[PDB]
Amino acid sequence: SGEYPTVNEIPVGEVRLYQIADGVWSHIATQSFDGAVYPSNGLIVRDGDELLLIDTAWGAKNTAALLAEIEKQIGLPVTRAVSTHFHDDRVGGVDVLRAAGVATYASPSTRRLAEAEGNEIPTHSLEGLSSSGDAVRFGPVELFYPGAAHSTDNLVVYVPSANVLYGGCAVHELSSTSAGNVADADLAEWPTSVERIQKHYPEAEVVIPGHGLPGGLDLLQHTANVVKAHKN
Ligand SMILES: C[C@@H](c1cccc2c(-c3ccc(NS(=O)(=O)C4COC4)c(F)c3)c(C(=O)O)[nH]c12)N1C[C@]2(C[C@@H](CN)C2)OC1=O
Ligand SMILES: [Zn+2]
Ligand SMILES: [Zn+2]
Numbered sequence: 001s002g003e004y005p006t007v008n009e010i011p012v013g014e015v016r017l018y019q020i021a022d023g024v025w026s027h028i029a030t031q032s033f034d035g036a037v038y039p040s041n042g043l044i045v046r047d048g049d050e051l052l053l054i055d056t057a058w059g060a061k062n063t064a065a066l067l068a069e070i071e072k073q074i075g076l077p078v079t080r081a082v083s084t085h086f087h088d089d090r091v092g093g094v095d096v097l098r099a100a101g102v103a104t105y106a107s108p109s110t111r112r113l114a115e116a117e118g119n120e121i122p123t124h125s126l127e128g129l130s131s132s133g134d135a136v137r138f139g140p141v142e143l144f145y146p147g148a149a150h151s152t153d154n155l156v157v158y159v160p161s162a163n164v165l166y167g168g169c170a171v172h173e174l175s176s177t178s179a180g181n182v183a184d185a186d187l188a189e190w191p192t193s194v195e196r197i198q199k200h201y202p203e204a205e206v207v208i209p210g211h212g213l214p215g216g217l218d219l220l221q222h223t224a225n226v227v228k229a230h231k232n
């Protein structure tokens with residue numbers, strides 16, 4: 001009924017959309033992993049009469065449900081997708097997208113990591129993102145590589161028309177107490193990577209984490225704090 005949708009509110013297999021700003025939505029789905037259920041976010045950005053998708057909905061069936069929810073709620077075709085790192089919450093569903101006519105993209109680093117680990121592999125490589133601080137335009141967004149954080153390949157996404165910063169899994173929600181799933185993280189570099197985000201996007205108005213509730217710029221400092229404490 002209008003609040004941001006939470007883990008116990010979304011059965012695994014269903015997807016909900018949340019309007020963030022004019023022409024910007026997040027998508028929210030839930031998935032089981034190692035015997036626990038988690039929510040996860042992605043982004044949808046209007047690109048004229050098409051849509052740009054950021055991240056899958058964490059699995060094939062969830063991503064099919066995402067496409068159906070977009071058709072119901074928005075009714076414009078998803079033509080391109082970018083995955084912001086190599087984990088299944090970002091690429092699981094890429095095969096569904098590709099067979100639905102979506103062109104799928106990720107950095108070469110993400111593509112290599114996905115391939116090596118047995119995750120689904122986006123089709124197209126995004127060059128120009130291999131050094132921290134790099135940025136490239138992609139339709140209505142800017143893609144930014146902040147450096148290693150949650151993963152070595154993690155990208156963030158900025159929507160300049162709306163000052164929306166999609167941090168993906170490099171950014172945690174305000175309620176977080178731990179740094180989430182740190183299996184592939186660089187805890188030592190993560191605060192430096194967040195500092196690069198803070199410096200590059202000082203006018204961000206909405207910050208969206210990879211999992212959990214959007215907020216403002218405080219998500220970035222909170223993330224740095226939780227990561228430093230986890231490491232400590
Ligand atoms: C698919 C993804 C994954 C799986 C399960 C959970 C998560 C979380 C996560 C976990 C917990 C909380 N929120 S919480 O519970 O409230 C917490 C904060 O305070 C207390 C959360 F928000 C997110 C993240 C994330 O952190 O992005 N990713 C996850 N994989 C799997 C893999 C690959 C490796 C294979 N060896 C392991 O690594 C990953 O990331
Ligand atoms: Zn991850
Ligand atoms: Zn994640």
